[PDB]
Design a protein around this ligand. Structure first.
Ligand SMILES: CCCCCCCCCCCCCC(=O)O
Lengths: 171, 171, 171, 171
């Protein structure tokens, strides 16, 4: 194995995650990346966004009864990636056919009428190349919108339109 | 576009930077990184760290008459790396002996009696790897604190003592 | 609910196919059939062909890193049909324009300078009649040579000459 | 040292190409080069090679209805390079994945058994050095055989064996 300081990520603890109870592992390297939005309150400062991650995780664990926040990684408009279940653990974002074989990253907000800052998009794309550097993703990985693999308006029309233009996007 | 990773550097235009006029180029690969502080105001939201980078640059351009902001890159307490003279333009930060044979990174704020948050440290940390991947920084680059190569309190007592504990630091 | 079962097709499990990671669906009924060859050794036994099929799949999967073997079906000189991605999943045989709208069937061998045995030809024909009965293929499906849609020698000259005479062949 | 120090290329109009209709661009500096062969006949005089470049384009444009010949450059055994879509326009040679991010150079002939002559090889390597010199290719670009990225025998065994020995070959 080879791992470097590839990319930067706010750690679980830094955004005061509840501890995870989730054990199923993804099989490296993962072929798919699925992009969603939370459809929730957006945020643009470290403080506001650590809090939002906390709120999303809190909704998933307390109300939905999930082992942890369902996303592998969240994205702030503050330009920071926030660690969910990470590269190694199966998430709960895209249903039972896609959760086993994908990494799910979710911008934090509603992207129906808005777009995310060029820094939010930079974070996400840098996260994925790091995923590749680390061997968590395949080099020939493919990105899909949430709406491609499940009946939903996630990741939001504005953002969906945006991710259609990525190098690795295949639908 | 593309790939507009790595390190996820904010671009000159995104912080509303005046254009660069500096032409002297860095002979590669670069052996040294010099870490400084600005000794300016701190900032904790991308909005305030865009304003702060703009302020530093103008001071350098309008008052000192430099071709551009003196540092190769800047680091907020927002958690992002802010492009300055970048990887290839020789900077203005460590004097005549060190300017040509090093990349200068400066943390925006005064770190005599406080530290940069871990996100600030994280971004600096990756930016440095993100520069080895390029050929910009040599694989075994040595990190120096401003006060190690010049007579200055930069980069603040607290920041300096953290820097002393990084693997690539050479007193 | 009626029964017209046309599968004298070796199922993946039986030629010990590795498991497909391919998710893209063809929509039925499919209008086009593209005939390629592997330009690899040919095999005239259920044992060699099963192996050959794993070898072809090892190339597309291990080496090239694809979700599965690229073809929808493979054809052997043993007179049998090997299930590749099957009737319902987009194959990777003929490019971005034809892949979504066709089934790719590949003869296991190099038919530049020999004709594929009559039984291999009967297998392919009967494979096609089977797809029609299933509603997998349009009753008026069109057969194309690989070289008619992509620059390549595939399916080999001798085999290409033969398919040019087929009822459903379309220049 | 000087501004343009590279390479002798037979321009489109000189080997009497049809006008290109392809407008999708590559992003310089390009990191990848894929080497194919035409698989057809070889030519060894600038008269016969201009003729062949004309044939290969006819096929790609007339039969396949493509916007221009698929390759970015072609190499004759006359030892001239023939301009295809060139440095800036995405070609058609290596599929959906590789095409947007590479430059496809194809040797005119079949090298399954027979090597390109020294002058043909010199031409291709000089072409590549020229692309780096112009910033069309990354200083550390990588070469791959067509078969390293698509399932095909090209660029032919003898020629594949040679490119594998090259400074920039990356398996
Ligand atoms: C193996 C990881 C995939 C690499 C993804 C490219 C992201 C940029 C980081 C590496 C530096 C490349 C230089 C550049 O493209 O400008």
């Amino acid at each position: 194995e080879d791992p470097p300081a590839c990319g930067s990520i706010v750690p679980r603890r830094e955004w005061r995650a509840l501890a995870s109870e989730c054990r199923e592992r993804l099989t490296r390297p993962v072929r798919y990346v699925v992009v969603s939005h939370t459809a929730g309150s957006h945020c643009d400062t470290p403080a506001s966004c650590a809090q939002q991650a906390q709120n999303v995780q809190s909704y998933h664990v307390r109300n939905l009864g999930w082992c942890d926040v369902g996303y592998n990684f969240l994205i702030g408009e503050d330009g920071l990636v926030y660690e969910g279940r990470g590269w190694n653990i199966k998430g709960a974002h895209a249903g039972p056919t896609w959760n086993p074989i994908s990494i799910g990253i979710s911008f934090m907000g509603n992207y129906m009428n808005r777009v995310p800052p060029p820094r939010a998009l930079r974070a996400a794309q840098n996260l994925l190349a790091c995923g590749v550097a680390l061997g968590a993703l395949r080099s020939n990985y493919e990105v899909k919108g949430h709406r491609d693999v499940q009946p939903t308006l996630s990741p939001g029309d504005r953002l969906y339109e945006i991710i259609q233009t990525w190098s690795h996007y295949r639908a």
